[PDB]
Amino acid sequence: CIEFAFKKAGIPIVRNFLHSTEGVIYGLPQRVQRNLAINYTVKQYKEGKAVSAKTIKTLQEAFPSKGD
Amino acid sequence: TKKQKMEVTLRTPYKEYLANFDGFSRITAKTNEASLVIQNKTPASLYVLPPGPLKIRFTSEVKNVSGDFLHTGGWVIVHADNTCEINVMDLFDRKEVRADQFEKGNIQDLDTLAGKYAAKSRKSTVRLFTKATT
Amino acid sequence: KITKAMKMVAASKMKAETSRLENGRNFAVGSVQKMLENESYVQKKKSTTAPKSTLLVPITSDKGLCGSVNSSIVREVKRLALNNRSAFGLLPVGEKGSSGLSRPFPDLLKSSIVNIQNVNFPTAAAIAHQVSTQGAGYDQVTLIYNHFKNAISYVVKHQELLPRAQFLNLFKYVTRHEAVEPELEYSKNYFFELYMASSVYNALLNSSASEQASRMNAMENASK
Amino acid sequence: MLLVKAVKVLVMGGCMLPIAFGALGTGVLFAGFNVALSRNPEETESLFNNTLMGFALIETFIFMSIGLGFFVLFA
Amino acid sequence: MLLVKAVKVLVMGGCMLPIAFGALGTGVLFAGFNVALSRNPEETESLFNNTLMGFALIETFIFMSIGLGFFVLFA
Amino acid sequence: MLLVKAVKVLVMGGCMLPIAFGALGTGVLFAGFNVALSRNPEETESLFNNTLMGFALIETFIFMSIGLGFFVLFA
Amino acid sequence: MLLVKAVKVLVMGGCMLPIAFGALGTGVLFAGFNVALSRNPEETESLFNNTLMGFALIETFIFMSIGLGFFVLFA
Amino acid sequence: MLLVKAVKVLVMGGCMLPIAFGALGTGVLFAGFNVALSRNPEETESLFNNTLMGFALIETFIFMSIGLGFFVLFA
Amino acid sequence: MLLVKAVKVLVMGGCMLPIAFGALGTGVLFAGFNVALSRNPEETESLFNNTLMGFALIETFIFMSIGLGFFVLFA
Amino acid sequence: MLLVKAVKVLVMGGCMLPIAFGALGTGVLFAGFNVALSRNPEETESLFNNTLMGFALIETFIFMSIGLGFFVLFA
Amino acid sequence: MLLVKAVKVLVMGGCMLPIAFGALGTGVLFAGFNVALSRNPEETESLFNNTLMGFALIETFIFMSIGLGFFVLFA
Amino acid sequence: MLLVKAVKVLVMGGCMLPIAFGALGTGVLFAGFNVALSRNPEETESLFNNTLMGFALIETFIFMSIGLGFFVLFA
Amino acid sequence: MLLVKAVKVLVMGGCMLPIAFGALGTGVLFAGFNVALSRNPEETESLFNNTLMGFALIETFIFMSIGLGFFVLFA
């Protein structure tokens, strides 16, 4: 359910679709598989560096949520 | 203001499959609520399709496209000028499904409010994809 | 010598990025804007104000010695903000932009995104989600990036996006296009996600291609 | 005679069932008009006109009934 | 005789039930027309025509009824 | 005479069926009004006005009915 | 005799209830046709044909009724 | 005489049909209110008021009916 | 005797109520068929077949009714 | 006398029709409540309260009915 | 005696109302089946079976009725 | 005497109409429960409980009816 | 006496109206079941069970009716 997943949790649609692929990534061709990857880095700035690594991308890493 | 006959545009961030097309005769996909069918003169509307199947009949065969596919999830808009555009994250042909390779280490999930809905959707689409190959 | 080899590999990189742009360009761009314009009732009930505060997201490459493009981006945003302050959140993207903007705009830039492994739609959607979260403070969002019109010509361009709150207040008026398979309350957030993500993705592609092309040109120049 | 007149008046009374059903039809029609207007307000006038049109035709029926009634009351 | 005439006029009265149901059907039809027009205004005329068509056929029933009524009043 | 008067008062009683159907129509109309308002609240007044309009017309029917009743009670 | 004829004509009158229900069914059917046409106009003709088909079958009922009526009126 | 009184009390009894239809209309109205609230809860108050408004008018009809009833019982 | 024959033919007349309800059911069924066809035209034939299937079963009822009627007319 | 008492008790019986319609209205109301709850569960309590509220008002009507019944049985 | 037999056959006739309502229920059921099939064609067979199941249960009612009818005709 | 008993037992019979309407309301309620469950399965239990609640209240009415029946059968 | 027996058997006949309404309710229930199954097939069994549950309760009403009928036939 996309509608209730968004209503009762802060799940974006892209996240829901990604979760949906998670179970089926290996069935899909490698061309599709290579695209579903998120790897970047967030730096807090107070004239200083605090660095988080955004790689999970399905949980509260790329797309925070109410449910998480 | 209005469009003669009809034009469809089916695009993916990694390749565009039909920049604009009149040759198709009909489009059928599955929404959450039910399966929808788009043809010419179909009124303006918005749809969001989970990762289901998408079939489009062609009057004339189009090179390199099959006419029956599996998308990972998409947005569909039917504009006022008799023009429908399909935007999907990714798309592929049923024949390349390579079924029975599912659940190869990402079975593990986390028990929260969101992990529950995510597992729900995952099982729904696993089931749907298994059915599609038949 | 190193210049020549760097140029030669940058050539292939620029080719790949240009192909990726050609395939990915015009992916769902102007779509939601078009449909919204088609809705007359929206235009009747549309709220028409000028945003007092907007949020600027410059997009720069992380790798050094890529050309003068990053310099151009930081120059434009520096002009725009030094001119008037407290009207911009300045969430940067790319190492070089953040680094160049640190000293000129302390306390304006709070976080940034760097070290992107590769470009894809999920990643751009994550960036869109970040900017959307930071968008609540500001009445408008805008993106500054190089537009890759030609292999040797990159032009700075800024896109203006309305934030999630304004977008939703506008979208609730939509009636000419029905949304009942997903309900309108969900569909508005959904198409907002689409509308931001498409723009961010286009921006990333154009910036990457322009970066590679400019690096190639400057490496040829330095070899010369 | 008296009995014929009685059944005449009984029919003239039965004339009120069409009024009931016309009232119910009006309710249904205006419910549809409200929902439609909310769904797409821009063309209220059009809906409005058509709505009023329907109601006119409703009372056409109604008057026919009473016509019939009076007829059978006097013929 | 007199009693036959009585039941005859009673049937001529019963002729008003179809009018009631036709009124309700008209209400339902025009509600549907409103909803359809709001959903897709572009084809008002078509809907409109079909709507009127339906209504004509409705009153066809009605006239049949009254025909029958007059028939049983005189046959 | 007495029998005619009896059927007269019976018709005056039958006058209450339109009231029942008008009540049901009012219920349906206001349900539709509620749904319409939830869909798109901005046009309360319009819906509201139209709703009341319909309802007014309902009681027109009703009063017509009672008119007939009194008529048949005294004519 | 007279009483048999009376109940005969009363049944021939009762024949009008199917007419009422056919009118209401026609209204409902054409409302559905309108809604369907708005949802997907391209195949109007098909809907139209099916719509008309339904109505034909409706009047089948009606004629059957009157057939029955005349039968019981004369047998 | 006696029979007139009988039919009088029979009408006063028939007065209960509007109550039935008002109850059903109330049920339908409150179902619509529930659905509307679920679709868009934010505007409870408005719906609530309108709902209650409708209900008041419903029993207005009802009381009118009983008024008529008492009249026919004593006039 | 006379009264038995009277109620016999009255029942044979009452046989027409199933015809009315079958007409209404046909109308509703074909409205559903129309909307369904608009929703998904690709499988018209299937819907069509099922529709006709339903209608056949409808007339089953009707024939049963008339069977019963003749039975009670002669038994 | 005897006949008046007979019609009195017959009316007291007719008192049960509002009960039937209240049962149907309760069914419809709770169906709407179910659908609404599924549509948006978070606000169960509110719907629930309103639902129960509606039901009370329904049986209010019903009780009025029985009052009338007893009245006409003894007045 | 004779009158008892008359009312017996009248009940056996009244047995046809369930047939009417079963016909209407079949119409509604098959309309729902059509719509359901259009929403999700893949599982026609399942719907089909369930549909037929429902219809069987419908005619179950009918047979009960006729059982009762014959019983009251002979007991 | 006997005639009073006759109308008494006739009312006790009329008690069966609420049962019919309660059956129809139960059908409608459980249809709503089914559709709601498909819309949002997660809260089956909740719907279920609420469903049963409604049905209980339905038969409350029913028992009231029969209460009345026995009362009117002996008073 | 004899007339008491007549009205007794008439009530036992009236027992068939609940059967009609149960048939219609079953039709509606299974239409809802079909639509629900199409909306979310995965939980057929659940719907199925609930469906059967509803139907059982329906026939509960029916049996109550005939119970009453037999009671009134012998008491």
Residue numbers in the entry:
A (entry chain e): 2 to 69
B (entry chain d): 24 to 157
C (entry chain g): 41 to 264
D (entry chain O), E (entry chain N), F (entry chain P), G (entry chain M), H (entry chain Q), I (entry chain L), ...: 1 to 75
Q: What do the authors of the reporting publication say about this deposited model?
A:
The F-type ATP synthase (F1Fo-ATP synthase) is responsible for generating most of the cellular adenosine triphosphate (ATP) from adenosine diphosphate (ADP) and inorganic phosphate through rotary catalysis. In eukaryotes, ATP synthases are found in the inner mitochondrial membrane. The type III ATP synthase was detected in ciliates where it induces tubulation of the cristae membranes. In this study, we present the cryo-EM structures of the type III ATP synthase dimer and tetramer with associated lipids from the model organism Tetrahymena thermophila in complex with the natural inhibitor IF1.
